[PDB]
Amino acid sequence: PNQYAALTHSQVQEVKAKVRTVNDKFHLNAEEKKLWELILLGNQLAQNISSCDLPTDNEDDASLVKLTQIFADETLERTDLTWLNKILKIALYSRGSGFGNCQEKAFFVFALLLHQAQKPESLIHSLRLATFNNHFILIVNEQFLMDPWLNLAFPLSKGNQQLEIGYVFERFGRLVNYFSINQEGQCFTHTIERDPSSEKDMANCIHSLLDHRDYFDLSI
């Protein structure tokens, strides 16, 4: 039993059941299936990062997860870094250490897809981190929702989107945006605000991800 779990076993099994219901009704085209497979691989790669707040987690990992969480809290409080850089530094620390909770794993997949989005003719166009309280998720191309904490993903019907988000996460409350990058390369940070400092920091941030390419390698 994981005393530190932030959801119950049943709460998890319910979400998985609804993601299954949702994925059954979605029939994707070829290009959507390519991005889909990348999203699945990215979520799966994120499971290298061990959490301690799921019922299936090992309570023996609680202290090393707390170490990442203290690093993350201190990093987010810094005044000398942009928000994009804070997110990426935490992504890198979590992957490098192998420990992180929901926030860290969401940040890692954001970093992975931001890195992938630089590759020639990538299908990655937008990335939106948003939260149900402290439960982070990632919306890709306003077309897919990823939950690396739970290793689940499902498509969204572009337009009406609270039908599937509101179905899967019915008893999870309001989704609040956290940080996003649109197809134009503009950055938004937490109600939403344009984030020109992150925009100006973009290249240096992308460079720091290249310096740990192995953290994000999905190559066959």
Author numbering: 58 to 247, 254 to 283
Excerpt from the publication:
Ceg10 is an uncharacterized effector secreted by Legionella pneumophila, the causative agent of human Legionnaires’ disease. We found the uncharacterized L. pneumophila-encoded Ceg10 protein to reproducibly break viral restriction in LD652 cells.
We determined the structure of the trypsin limited-proteolysis protected core (Ceg10TR) from three different data sets to 1.7 Å, 1.4 Å and 1.5 Å resolution, respectively. The significant level of trace divalent metal ions present in commercial preparations of sodium or potassium phosphate, and the extended time between initiation of crystal growth and harvesting is likely the reason the protein crystallized in data set 1 has lost the S-nitrosothiol, as metal catalyzed decomposition has been well documented for this post-translational modification. The catalytic Cys (C159), Asp (D204) and His (H192) are labeled as well as residues Asp110 and Trp 206 which are hydrogen bonded to each other in both structures.
